Homo-oligomer: A and B are copies of this chain.
């Protein structure tokens, strides 16, 4: 029974942590994607302002 416990832990644990630690990547993607679009859109808008 504590065997089947360890397989269940490993399976659900592995799947969930894979999803969350990938969401870390989409998160840092959001971080520096916001940072880049900040100045990018900034220069389009300040070029269309004049």
Interface residues of A (CB under 8 A from B): 1-2, 4-44, 46-48, 50
Cβ–Cβ contact B37 & A32, under 8 A: no
With a cutoff of 8 Å between Cβ atoms, the chain B residues found around residue A17 in the complex are 5, 8-9, 25
Main secondary structure of the interface of A (DSSP, over half): helix
Q: How many copies does the complex hold?
A: 2
**Contacts A10-B1, A15-B8; is A28 near B34 (CB within 8 Å)?**
no
CB distance from A40 to the nearest CB of B (A): 4
CB distance from A34 to the nearest CB of B (A): 5
| A17, A35, A39 pick with most chain B CB within 10 angstroms | A17
The answer, among B14, B27, B31, for a CB contact under 8 Å with A8, is B14
